[PDB]
């Protein structure tokens, strides 16, 4: 399900910067870096895998050596690289199993360079600036060899100690909760019917407005949105002629329900009755 690290560095001016580092399991955050105290923080007990504190002390110091050195490095060559203040560098690196691995860098929110097996390759649209940056990035081969073993050896090994340790957490089933309301922007003579679905985990979910057995193909499903407790949210809206909102219901299917769909009816004060 792919574990990866993200790196955000923002260079506002020649002497003011912000730095953010975190580790992720797909959508789920598992680690954070503290710029104060230079500590890797574990968001869950199982974030450590089967790894020892003596090994985390070394990872931290490798993370810190690279994080700090990547800073003044960008700062020194920023003119020889035509980097203009303000600007942001983003990096994502990680691996996927059954097998793959990646390490990509963006400048100003666009593809810039990436790491292929043993060295940094520039993206060909990124131009000569990216070619020069790969020159600096590739000045030491031993460093590139160490970057290879991190993606090729260290990353898939961590996915070992991580997915096993956190199975009880990623395999939970949290039943959804649903409710109905009036959407804000109906056209003239029409209504907008909104079915909210929240509190569910994992992510895959099914929601449709219905007339008995018939799925209403005007159902518009929005984005699935996060909550701080780790569950997801979704709205599904249907526009209808004002009188033609009779017999409509909202139906939710979710793995946690074991076939017991949620069915709510456009009824009562919603219609409104007499």
């Amino acid at each position: 399900l792919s574990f990866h690290v993200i790196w955000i560095a923002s260079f506002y001016n020649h002497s003011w910067k912000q730095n953010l580092v975190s580790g992720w399991l797909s959508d789920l955050q598992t680690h954070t870096w503290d710029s104060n105290s230079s500590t890797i923080v574990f968001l869950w007990p199982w974030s450590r895998g089967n790894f020892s504190n003596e090994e985390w002390k070394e990872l931290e110091t490798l993370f810190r050596i690279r994080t700090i050195r990547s800073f003044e490095g960008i700062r020194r060559y920023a003119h020889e690289l035509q980097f203009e203040y303000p600007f942001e560098i983003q990096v994502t690196g990680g691996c996927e199993l059954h097998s793959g691995s990646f390490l990509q860098l963006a400048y100003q929110g666009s593809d810039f360079v990436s790491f292929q097996n043993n060295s940094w390759l520039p993206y060909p649209v990124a131009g000569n600036m990216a070619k020069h940056f790969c020159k600096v990035l590739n000045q030491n081969q031993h460093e590139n060899d160490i970057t290879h073993n991190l993606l090729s050896d260290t990353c898939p090994r961590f996915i070992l100690g991580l997915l096993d340790a956190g199975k009880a957490h990623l395999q939970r089933q949290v039943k959804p909760e649903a409710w109905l309301s009036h959407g804000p922007s109906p056209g003239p003579g029409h209504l907008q019917l909104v079915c909210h679905v929240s509190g569910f985990y994992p992510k895959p979910v099914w929601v449709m407005w219905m007339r008995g057995e018939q799925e209403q193909q005007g159902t518009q499903r929005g984005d699935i949105l996060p909550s701080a407790d780790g569950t997801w949210y979704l709205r599904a809206t249907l526009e209808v002629a004002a009188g033609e909102a009779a017999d409509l219901s909202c139906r939710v299917k979710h793995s946690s329900l074991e076939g017991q769909d949620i069915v709510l009816y456009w009824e009562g004060s919603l219609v409104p009755r007499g």
Binding site: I6, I8, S10, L20, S22, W24, Q29, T32, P86, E88, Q90, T92, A106, G109, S110, E177, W179, S181, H182, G183, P184, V194, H196, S198, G199, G222, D223, L225, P226, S227, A228, D229, Y233, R235, S269, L270, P272
Partner: protein, 104 residues
């Protein structure tokens, strides 16, 4: 170039007056990362607001969740207010909720 934020406001539970709840504002697809987000109650800024750690999507655009615990009543209107380099003025998106039939 720059990317203007998408702003989406939702509650964690169905709205019920006098019952504790959570107001969320999800802000996504923006670049650069410098952004200013406030949750409002009756147009006044709410003080205890948490947010998730800044992250980014595959297309490198950033996203953030702001949230606070709250108890709604029948008077109060809530909103999310965002400001960004792509915005001429701060953009405000309201928490849409039903108030029941107006007619007694």
């Amino acid at each position: 170039i720059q990317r203007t934020p998408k702003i989406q406001v939702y509650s964690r539970h169905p709205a019920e007056n006098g019952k504790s709840n959570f107001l969320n504002c999800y802000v996504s697809g923006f670049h650069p990362s410098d952004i200013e987000v406030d949750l409002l109650k009756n147009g006044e800024r709410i003080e205890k607001v948490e947010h998730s750690d800044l992250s980014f999507s595959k297309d490198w655009s950033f996203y953030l969740l702001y949230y606070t615990e709250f108890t709604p009543t029948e008077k109060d209107e809530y909103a999310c207010r965002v400001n960004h380099v792509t915005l001429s003025q701060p953009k405000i998106v309201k928490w849409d909720r039903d108030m029941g039939s107006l007619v007694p």
